[PDB]
């Protein structure tokens, strides 16, 4: 196939162009709602943590696939491992609200706590980049899912439910230094 390149129209040639045959494909695993629905770690927890999804690792599965979109919407699930009770306040709450049990408070069971949180931001969508400020490198302070608090939190996991992504951005792979391709060890049985 030949076409006008500078017009930027999408062109999809087939193997039928020289006698081949396009085969049936199944793309269940690259579905946006499917791939973002797994628990991923948040490796900076405090006694008080504000749930911000831009704190996932930038090279993880969900972390990187979230950096590869401009806007997003999602509910949330969290798995917290804490001592004492765990208080959650929604988006917009004072920081002093986290010391009272009128808010969602979880009395700790043995292994950990697994909750489901809604989307409470005042905006229709959240963003991973922001060109500018919001007061009178840093996103607006209203780009969060709430805050949690315990006497000490050991680990935090998050999961995106009903995820929707908009306006894709670059997504990079590890760079090849001098090789012909990036070679690494792949699992193979012993002996």
């Amino acid at each position, epitope marked *: 196939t030949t076409s006008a390149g500078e017009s930027a129209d999408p062109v999809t040639t087939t193997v039928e162009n020289y006698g081949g045959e396009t085969q049936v494909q199944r793309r269940h695993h690259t579905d946006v709602g499917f791939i973002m629905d797994r628990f991923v770690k948040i*490796n*900076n*927890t*405090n006694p008080t943590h504000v749930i911000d999804l831009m704190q996932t690792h930038q090279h993880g599965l969900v972390g990187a696939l979230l950096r590869a979109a401009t806007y997003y919407f999602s509910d949330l699930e969290i798995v917290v*491992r804490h*001592e004492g009770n765990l208080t959650w306040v929604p988006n917009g709450a004072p920081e002093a609200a986290l010391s009272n049990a009128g808010n969602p408070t979880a009395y700790n069971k043995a292994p950990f706590t697994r909750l489901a949180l809604p989307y409470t931001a005042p905006h229709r969508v959240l963003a991973t980049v922001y060109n500018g400020t919001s007061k009178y490198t840093q996103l607006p302070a209203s780009f969060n899912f709430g805050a949690i608090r315990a006497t*000490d939190i*050991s*680990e935090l996991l998050v999961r995106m439910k009903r995820a929707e992504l908009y306006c894709p951005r670059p997504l990079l792979a590890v760079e090849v230094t001098a090789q012909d391709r990036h070679k690494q060890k792949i699992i193979a049985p012993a002996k």
Partner: nanobody, 125 residues
């Protein structure tokens, strides 16, 4: 399961500094707590300083609070105990440890799982 590789021991004299390191053999996705135990000559093992893997939550002993400093390298999966302004009492056998099973601050110095053979640090005067 997991074996610990220690580095950086040796001999110094009072007033200098030393740097101990420890890297575990496997890089499993756990929240382990790297710590340092020391055993003085003719005395029993005791806790010095620990650090959590997730955050930089550091515990310390009353003996070594302002002098010693512990850190972790997320990339290289290591931990370093920067010993400063050593005293002649700091002569001991320094051991690292793992403590994989529970990672709460209140218990961060009581029950470790994998030790790894100790290093020798003998400061002179």
């Amino acid at each position: 399961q997991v074996q610990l590789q220690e580095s950086g021991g040796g001999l110094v004299q009072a007033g200098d500094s030393l740097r101990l390191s420890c890297v575990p053999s496997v890089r499993t996705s756990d929240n382990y707590i790297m710590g340092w135990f020391r055993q003085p000559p003719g005395k029993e093992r005791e806790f010095v300083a620990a650090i959590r893997r997730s955050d930089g939550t550091t515990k310390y002993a009353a003996s070594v609070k302002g002098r010693f400093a512990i850190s972790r390298d997320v990339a290289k999966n290591a931990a370093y105990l920067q010993m400063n302004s050593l005293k002649a009492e700091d002569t001991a056998v320094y051991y690292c440890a793992a403590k994989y099973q529970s990672t709460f601050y209140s218990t961060m110095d009581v029950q470790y799982d994998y030790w790894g053979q100790g290093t020798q640090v003998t400061v002179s005067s």
